[PDB]
């Protein structure tokens, strides 16, 4: 191990252990504030010493010296603002003011975690934070969070610990700075290189780590983030399973896997200084920083937020103040002819190098294509495939919208039979009327009530899509707002296709065998779509059909052809 | 081919083809009755001649001579009642009476299929039908349908054809008596043995068929039922897929697969006579009847509805009147030492016989265990496993019930994380409050409203279970009625587990940090479970736990152990 | 709407793609209509070819293609034979 940053490990949970009962009791009495997931990651690392010397959510004095000088008021280096935000309504409703004692509660199990004592309650310049800490790009994940999720005020204050967060996943692999230190001891280690990561580890990474181990004569701590990462990365359960598949590739007893409940910001260079501090608090003697450490890639105009290696420079600016040795690496690649990996600054400008990008990997994962062993070990690839299956087995939703009696309900049942013939997956059919009877029996037909209904279809459709089913829904869905809502939700889990059954109102009305359009026409049914209520025509549907000009059979054939072109009907 | 039963093939669709336009027009005007799925099977076979001489739903004259003499008023043999039932309310509302002309409509695509001209409208003695046609056992499928689904009155009458049903599955393998006949012709066939079936075909069945073909010097017609079959058999898409996998096992051009839209009743002996008639109408010169033909096995008290071979006797009783040659077979088995199959009565008492029962098969499918090639071909077994996966990949539902704030919500989230760690499937979490917000935002807390809510959970749970998900739901679910409803729905698709979080009301109330039990106590919240509304305690739950005596972590561990003992956590 | 595909050889991947492309573009069903009468002097016998076409069918989405044999005696007349083929397919009912 190594000494904590600042000299004292701020293990608030060990400090306040003797007062637990009392603190608990006192916590039942104060006004409680319930934490967001990101504040819960921060609170966990504060309470266990991970953010030493910090020992509570930053007050303005501390905050400002970081927002601009990468230091805490006490002078210690610290590059990342760690604050507890709240809205004016909560500040008032709870009567929060300096010197107040609030309880911080776990939204997951309602437990009282800590008691914070307010120093101040300031309103920060979200623009200067945006710009001074996370570069300035509005597309940057941290900045987007800063504006859309972070409330208006920051409540600074020291923390006293009531309970350690509960976690039900991987408890034996989670460690507090104190526990990890005791472990390095139990193992008899003295020099430990820590490896940060928010992705599955491939061949190249196994090499960085063994290289660092060999060069610094150190043991390896694979220390992945399991809290919050970049917006769309592979879930942590898949990643942990992947890190575990990799362990057997190191010589017996050389590496140890320990999980870090950090909530990354993707602050590139700053986040890198921050990471070094954290690993030092956890007891690592060395820490790897490679290409694009903690970087979130590039923005929409294709410009990338930080340059490669900038984070290595930043962590370098404080070589003398960060009490942990950084081990640098340049992009590592594969040399086919020699069958080896090395940093680019070691390949003779004439030698052949291979590399599979993020995009190429997703392409192969999606298509079922082979992924080279020089790239990633077999057991790892297997795990990745189990989580990101090919289109051949992914679920999807076919969303149908059109006037009542436009043929959308017959098209839906035929598509269902057709896909059951096709065979790949379980097919769930949600006909407008079925949804109305089974899920929305009590809603009405007001714009708000219809919107609610379509949201209900989307909630169900998303869970079925996530389980790999083929969901077929055919409600009227008059408003573009509900439809886009539907599409956004399902898209979180898989493909969503909007098929607009644009059969003309006259046709629909003239063939209604249930005299519903009739009753509407004689005012027995108020606000009926097409007669009273509107029908916002879909602007950019994936497919437009007409039961006036095409038959159920060929409309079905057209939908099938779309699923086919995108690989959903391939063989599993 | 062979001549229709009664001499004239009742191809109503071919008959009325010239009057299509007119009949169509007239159909738009009469009061329409919408057909159930079973009536649609019956209607399809009536209109195409499959039930020749019959040519409409049976009127009481025809009906009664069958209810008891296995003959139609015209004398011809016919052992199965084919009627169109309706309730008093429909008979009135539509003003149905003798001489009336009703339109019969397809509930699938709303199309107008036929026009029936009412002869009579009688109220049948469901107990005499039950007893004279389907033996008398109340557990018999047909009987259970007779009492729970069949309405109170039967409406007799001849039929005129407007449209042929539409089908989107396997249209090229579906055939009308007329098409089949033209096909036997095209192929140059003259003797045709037809094979009835509602199950995947194994080795034994390939042997019956080739034996009958060799003996009667005939070609083979594999003629499976694709309409309605016994309550829990393998769906017809999986079966057709399995029949198609089998074809290559016959010598080139010896067998033809054709599907029959029949709605079986599982009437053993009578159904057998009926099948002979149907196959005759379709043009088959011979028809196989083996052990337990059309039988639904045995009742609950273990007594089996019909005896083996009884159906062979009954079809024999009319050898002279059924114009098609029956080919009998005794149970066929496998002789290991010789590696051959033959009927039992041709097996010496000396010899050993291998056989895999229905139960042994489901046991192996459920466990992933190997299924011998002497029993069924590899491609067939493959298809069967795709449809009936091992417990290792089946979905399931964990249903939690207990008082508000009994810990069921925290248990639920922990179980979710736990199963995500575990890994096999997609996990959907439906917490009481989430369900209320996402699916029942408008319901209240009236016995009816809660019951509605639990049904809504069950609807969504069933669809997810069917797609192989692990569904975790934790609503209060105060009434046993709602719970049993939930259990019955999910069970249709997979396993359901009821976990009663029996945490005592006092404990729940005393730990409520949201002051909800408080507001209930000072009447601000009417009918709150435990304070006003009741909580019917679960009588036979799969697991009972108490957040007062056990912790979330071990409650979760107890659930996990249950899933494990039943094979759900095995490896896929 | 039926796109017909003429052929006197086994169908490989490339051909499976033409056909699905035409089907998608002309919003049509596929009629794999191979010659089984007389073909170029040394091509693969028709029994082997039919066997091959049959092995290919499962590669199209269920119910999208139909295999029908044509008893034609090709001449290998390039351009003229092409006009001829269009006529023949039209007589057989293909729309494309
Ligand atoms: N091919 C590579 N060559 C060198 N360093 C790399 C390479 N890939 C990743 N790294 C470095 O190894 C760690 C792996 O990072 P990632 O999990 O991809 O994302 S990060 O946000 O944690 O940096 C970081 O230190 C990163 O800079
Ligand atoms: N005011 C109404 N407008 C449209 N359909 C209605 C209305 N009142 C009842 N219905 C019936 O309810 C179904 C329409 O329901 P949905 O498709 O669920 O509509 S949506 O607006 O929410 O998309 C059809 O059976 C329709 O006949
Ligand atoms: N082992 C067997 N030996 C001989 N005939 C059999 C055997 N199993 C089933 N059969 C017969 O073959 C047909 C197929 O049987 P099933 O599809 O299981 O059930 S049935 O209800 O349609 O008859 C029927 O004639 C049946 O009695
Ligand atoms: N009368 C009530 N009884 C119980 N819970 C209620 C009542 N009114 C509101 N609630 C709230 O709604 C949830 C209980 O809802 P459910 O579990 O969905 O009830 S259930 O009986 O229909 O299963 C808890 O958040 C509870 O505080």
* Domains of chain B and any CATH numbers: 1-188 (3.10.400.10), 189-388 (3.40.50.620), 389-572 (3.40.50.300)
Q: How many CA atoms lie within 13 A of A253 on its CB side?
A: 6
Q: What tokens appear for B163 in the block?
A: 């449209």
Cβ(A142)–Cβ(A134) below 8 Å: yes
Q: Is A397 in a helix, a strand, or coil?
A: strand
- The torsion angles phi and psi of A6, rounded to 5 degrees, stand at 95, -10
Name residue, tokens 């089998």.
Answer: B246
Element of type H or E holding A33: strand A32-34
Cβ(B47)–Cβ(B114) below 8 Å: yes
Name residues 106-135 of chain A within 8 A of B (Cβ).
108-110
Element of type H or E holding A85: strand A85-86
Q: How far apart are CA B261 and CA B1, in angstroms?
A: 20
Q: How far apart are CA A34 and CA B409, in angstroms?
A: 17
Q: How far apart are CA B247 and CA B46, in angstroms?
A: 29
Element of type H or E holding B401: strand B396-401
Cβ(A525)–Cβ(B122) below 8 Å: no
Q: What tokens appear for C82 in the block?
A: 């092409």
Minimum CA–CA partner of B449 in chain A: A442
Q: How many secondary structure helices (H) and strands (E) does chain B include?
A: 21, 19
Q: Which long-range contacts (CB under 8 A, 24 or more apart) does B479-484 make?
A: B479/B447, B479/B450, B479/B451, B479/B454, B479/B534, B479/B536, B480/B536, B480/B538, B480/B539, B481/B451, B482/B450, B482/B451, B482/B453, B482/B454, B482/B455, B483/B399, B483/B401, B483/B454, B483/B538
Angstrom CA distances, A289 to A314, A329, B24, B321, stand at 11, 7, 78, 91
Q: Are strands B192-197 and B219-224 parallel, antiparallel or unpaired?
A: parallel
Indicate yes or no: CB of A557 within 8 angstroms of CB of C20: no
Q: Is B342 in a helix, a strand, or coil?
A: strand
Task: Spot the catalytic one: C1, C7, C19, C49.
Answer: C7
The per-residue DSSP string of A212-278 comes to HHHHTT-EEEEEEB-SB-STTPPPHHHHHHHHHHHGGGS-TTSEEE-BB--B----HHHHHHHHHHH
Instruction: Say which ligand is closest to the CA of B333.
Output: 3
What is the nearest CA distance from A106 to chain B, expressed in angstroms?
A: 11
Angstrom CA distances, A156 to A48, A101, A263, A267, stand at 18, 12, 19, 22
**B264 CB neighbour count, 10 Å cutoff:** 24
Q: How far apart are CA C81 and CA C87, in angstroms?
A: 10
Minimum CA–CA partner of A407 in chain B: B109
∠ CA C43-C48-C53, nearest 5°, is: 100
Of residues C2, C35, C33, C5, the one with CA closest to residue C17: C5
Indicate yes or no: CB of A468 within 8 angstroms of CB of B463: no
What is the nearest CA distance from C49 to chain A, expressed in angstroms?
A: 24
Q: What tokens appear for A347 in the block?
A: 């390949």
Helix, strand, coil abundance in chain C, percent, nearest 5: 45, 20, 40
Q: How many CA atoms lie within 13 A of B504 on its CB side?
A: 6
Q: Is B251 in a helix, a strand, or coil?
A: coil
Give the residue ranges of DSSP H helices in A48-165: 60-69, 88-93, 126-133, 141-148
Distance of CA B50 to the CA centre of its chain: 22
Beta bridge partners of B228: B263
Element of type H or E holding A472: strand A470-474
Q: How far apart are CA A142 and CA B208, in angstroms?
A: 71
Q: Are strands B470-474 and B396-401 parallel, antiparallel or unpaired?
A: parallel
Instruction: Say which ligand is closest to the CA of A193.
Output: 1
Q: Which chain B residues are closer than 8 Å to C63 by Cβ?
A: 170-172
Q: How far apart are CA B311 and CA B293, in angstroms?
A: 6
Q: Residue B332: CB within 6 Å of ligand 3?
A: yes
Of residues A292, A242, A243, A244, the one with CA closest to residue A266: A292
The pick from A141, A208, A356 for probing ligand 1's pocket by mutation, whose C-beta has the most ligand atoms within 8 angstroms, reads A208
Q: How far apart are CA B139 and CA A8, in angstroms?
A: 77
Element of type H or E holding A104: strand A101-105
Name residues 412-471 of chain A within 8 A of C (Cβ).
418, 421-423
- The resolution in Å comes to 2.8
Stated length of chain C: 96
Give the residue ranges of DSSP H helices in B282-427: 310-317, 358-367, 378-387, 408-422
Q: How far apart are CA B436 and CA A437, in angstroms?
A: 17
* Index of the ligand 1 atom closest to the CA of residue A333: 1
Q: Is C60 in a helix, a strand, or coil?
A: coil
Q: Residue A155: CB within 6 Å of ligand 1?
A: no
Distance A343 CA to ligand 1 centre (A): 13
Q: How far apart are CA B293 and CA B308, in angstroms?
A: 8
């Amino acid at each position: 191990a190594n000494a904590p940053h600042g000299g004292v490990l701020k293990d608030l949970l060990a400090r306040d252990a003797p007062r637990q009962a009392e603190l608990a009791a006192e916590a039942e009495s104060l006004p409680a504030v319930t934490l967001t997931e990101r504040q819960l990651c921060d609170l966990e690392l504060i309470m266990n010493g991970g953010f030493s010397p910090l020992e509570g959510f930053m007050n303005q004095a501390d905050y400002d010296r970081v927002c601009e000088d990468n230091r805490l008021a006490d002078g210690n280096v610290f590059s990342m603002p760690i604050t507890l935000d709240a809205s004016q309504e909560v500040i008032d409703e709870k009567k929060l003011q300096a010197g107040s004692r609030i309880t911080l509660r776990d939204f997951r199990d309602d437990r009282n975690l800590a008691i914070l004592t307010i120093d101040d309650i300031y309103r920060p310049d979200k623009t200067k934070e945006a710009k001074l800490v996370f570069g300035g790009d509005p597309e940057h994940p941290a900045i987007v969070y800063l504006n859309n999720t972070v409330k208006e005020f920051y409540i600074g204050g020291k923390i006293e610990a009531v309970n350690k967060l509960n976690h039900y996943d991987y408890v034996a692999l989670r460690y507090t700075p104190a526990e990890l230190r005791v472990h390095f001891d139990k193992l008899g280690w003295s020099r430990v290189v820590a490896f940060q990561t928010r992705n599955p580890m491939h061949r190249a990474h196994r090499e960085l780590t063994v290289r660092a181990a060999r060069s610094r004569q150190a043991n390896v701590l694979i220390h992945p983030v399991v809290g919050l990462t970049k917006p769309g990365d592979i879930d942590h359960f898949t990643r942990v399973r992947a890190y575990q598949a990799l362990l057997p590739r190191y010589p017996n007893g050389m590496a140890v896997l320990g999980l870090l409940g950090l909530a990354m910001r993707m602050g590139g260079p700053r986040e890198a200084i921050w990471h070094a501090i954290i690993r030092k608090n956890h007891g690592a003697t060395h820490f790897i920083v490679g290409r694009d450490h903690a970087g979130p890639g590039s923005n929409s105009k294709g410009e990338d937020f930080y340059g490669p290696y900038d984070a290595q420079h930043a962590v370098e600016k404080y070589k003398d103040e960060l009490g942990i040795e950084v081990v640098e690496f340049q992009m590592v690649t594969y040399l086919p002819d020699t069958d080896e990996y090395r940093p680019v600054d070691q390949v003779p400008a004439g030698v052949k190098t291979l590399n599979i990008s993020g995009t190429e990997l997703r392409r192969r994962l999606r298509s079922g294509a082979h992924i080279p062993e020089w790239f990633s070990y077999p057991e790892v690839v297997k795990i990745l495939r189990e989580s990101n299956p090919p289109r051949a087995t992914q679920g999807f939703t076919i969303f149908l919208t059109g006037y009542m009696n436009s043929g959308k309900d017959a098209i839906a049942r035929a598509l269902q039979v057709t896909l059951n013939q096709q065979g790949g997956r379980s097919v769930s059919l949600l006909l407008g009327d079925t949804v109305r009877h089974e899920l929305s029996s009590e809603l009405g037909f007001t714009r708000e009530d219809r919107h609610t209904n379509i949201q209900r279809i989307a909630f169900v459709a998303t869970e079925l899509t996530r389980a790999g089913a083929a969901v077929i829904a055919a409600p009227i869905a008059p408003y573009e707002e509900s439809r886009k809502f539907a599409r956004d939700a399902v898209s979180q889990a898989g493909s969503f296709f909007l098929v607009h059954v644009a059969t003309p109102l006259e046709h629909c009305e003239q063939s209604d065998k249930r005299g519903i359009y009739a009753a509407a026409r004689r005012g027995e049914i108020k606000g009926f779509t097409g007669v009273d209520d509107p029908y916002e025509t879909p602007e950019k549907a994936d497919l437009v059909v007409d039961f006036s000009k095409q038959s159920v059979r060929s409309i079905v054939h057209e939908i099938i052809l779309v699923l086919e072109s995108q690989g959903f009907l391939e063989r599993q």
